[PDB]
Each structure stands twice: as structure tokens, then as C-alpha cells.
């Protein structure tokens, strides 16, 4: 029922019956794979990619048409970034609150949230470290996190 707030939504994508393709929506596995790896070199993330693939072009899922997911495509071509997609988007937000707090000493409910986002990261990092994506004995935080971003 959400991680942090007390709001219990099911804002959700459904996923249709067919693991198989919706045949008529054409293209190819390789053509879509080449389509993807352009966007992986343009800097766009799996989540952005798959929106672009879906919205304009005829893809439903890369999972469907290619067999591989997307990150799994990108990894196979060496275009997945060091710091994972999701974590990176939190590490960005962290910085964008740590920055806002440095200016605003007196601002409590942002300090509150910053303590959330920080914690959310250490949930995800601690996940990723145990997967063996990020190397362990490596903490993803605040001072050096600004450098990890840029």
C-alpha cells in the first residue's frame, strides 16, 4: 500500500493475455533491437525507450517482439549505465532536495522527505549490492552522491 505514504493506490498497467505477439503489428525483432540501441546511445533509459517504442512505433513490449526485455538488450550491447536506471532517478531527486535544503535551513517537511528519499535509495542500493550489479562496500548517499550523478 505504497512504501512511504499512507496512500493506497493501484495506478497500474495491466498486461494482456498474450505472451505471444499481436501479430499484425509488424516490424522485426532485429529491426526493433537496432531501434532500441540507437536510443541507448542517445542516452534514453529503458523506461523512456519502451514508451517511445510503444507510443509512436508498433511495439507493445520488447519482451514480446524481441524475447529479451530491454535492459537485457541494452546490457547485451554494453549500453546499460553503471548506476541502474531507477536508482539513478532517485539519486537525482536526492540531490535536488539536498540542494534545496542547503539553501533553506528552516524547512522541516522537506528534511522529512529527504530522509525518505535517502532511505529509499539505501533500500534500492542494498538490493542492488546483493544482486551484484553495484560492487559492495560502497554506500550511495549525499556528499559523494553529487559526484556519482555528475
Amino acid at each position: 500500500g505504497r512504501m512511504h505514504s499512507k496512500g493506497k493506490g493501484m495506478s497500474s498497467s495491466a498486461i494482456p493475455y498474450s505472451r505471444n505477439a499481436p501479430a499484425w503489428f509488424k516490424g522485426s525483432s532485429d529491426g526493433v533491437v537496432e531501434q532500441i540501441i540507437k536510443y541507448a546511445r542517445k542516452g534514453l533509459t529503458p523506461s523512456q525507450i519502451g514508451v517511445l517504442l510503444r507510443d509512436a512505433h508498433g511495439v507493445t513490449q520488447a519482451k514480446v517482439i524481441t524475447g529479451n526485455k530491454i535492459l537485457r538488450i541494452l546490457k547485451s550491447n554494453g549500453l546499460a549505465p553503471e548506476i541502474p536506471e531507477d536508482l539513478y532517478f532517485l539519486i537525482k531527486k536526492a540531490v535536488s532536495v539536498r540542494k534545496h535544503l542547503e539553501r533553506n535551513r528552516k524547512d522541516k517537511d522537506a528534511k522529512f522527505r529527504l530522509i525518505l528519499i535517502e532511505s529509499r535509495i539505501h533500500r534500492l542500493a542494498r538490493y542492488y549490492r546483493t544482486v551484484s550489479v553495484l560492487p559492495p562496500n560502497w554506500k550511495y548517499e549525499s556528499a559523494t552522491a553529487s559526484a556519482l550523478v555528475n
Binding site: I15, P16, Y17, S18, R19
Partner: protein
């Protein structure tokens, strides 16, 4: 989180059977559920049941018979040492006479009478009476 699906399922059953619904829906739907239900079918606490494949997780439709009274679940799956079955079934079911204690084991998911014939115990799941 949704923890013991089996329980969370059997709870819906127990609510359904209480009101006298002729059927129930059960979201998550496992092996254990189905081998648990299968057991209820072999004794006759349960009618047909129809395992939907969401191209996904599970989902079941049970047909209740008006025969279930309680579709018990005991919660931390206690290991049972063969003689200790008698103490579980004594403390869970009404009477030496009739009832079943659905226990997973080496043999699969038996009831406590079948598990005595076989001479093979294990963990408990639930019961029916």
C-alpha cells in the same frame, strides 16, 4: 504484505461458506492451495474448482457444497513428529470420529488419516471440520 496465500485463500472460502455462497474466487492460487483443495475434493467438502490461468499468477473458482464448516489453517507450519499428530487433530477437529488435518509432507499433501496409514508425517497446513 500478502503472506500465507493458502490462509488468505481459505479465509475467503470460510467467509463464503459462512454466508452460503455457492462458490468463491481466490486470487493468488498455488500448488499448495490446489493440493489442499484437491484433498477437500477427495473427502467431499468442496465441489468443482476451476483454476483460471491469468497469463500470470493464478486464480481459482471454488464451488462450495454446503459441507465445509471450517476450512482451517494453522499458521507457522509446525513440524509434527508422527505421535504429535494425535495432539493436533485432538486439539483442532471435533471428535476422534470425523475431520481431517491437512498436512504437507515427504509424501506430498495428505490428510492426517492418510499420513497415518503411510507412516509418514511432516508439517501442517490446515484442517477441515
Amino acid at each position: 504484505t500478502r503472506t500465507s496465500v493458502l490462509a488468505d485463500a481459505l479465509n475467503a472460502i470460510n467467509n463464503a461458506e459462512k454466508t452460503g455462497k455457492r462458490q468463491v474466487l481466490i486470487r493468488p492460487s498455488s500448488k499448495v492451495i490446489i493440493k489442499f483443495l484437491q484433498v477437500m475434493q477427495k473427502h467431499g467438502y468442496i465441489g468443482e474448482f476451476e483454476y483460471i490461468d491469468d497469463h500470470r499468477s493464478g486464480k481459482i473458482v471454488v464451488q462450495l457444497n454446503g459441507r465445509l464448516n471450517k476450512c482451517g489453517v494453522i499458521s507457522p507450519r509446525f513440524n509434527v513428529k508422527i505421535a504429535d499428530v494425535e495432539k493436533w487433530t485432538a486439539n483442532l477437529l471435533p471428535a476422534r470420529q470425523f475431520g481431517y488435518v491437512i498436512l504437507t509432507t515427504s509424501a506430498g499433501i495428505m490428510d492426517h488419516e492418510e499420513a497415518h496409514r503411510k507412516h509418514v508425517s511432516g508439517k501442517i497446513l490446515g484442517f477441515v471440520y
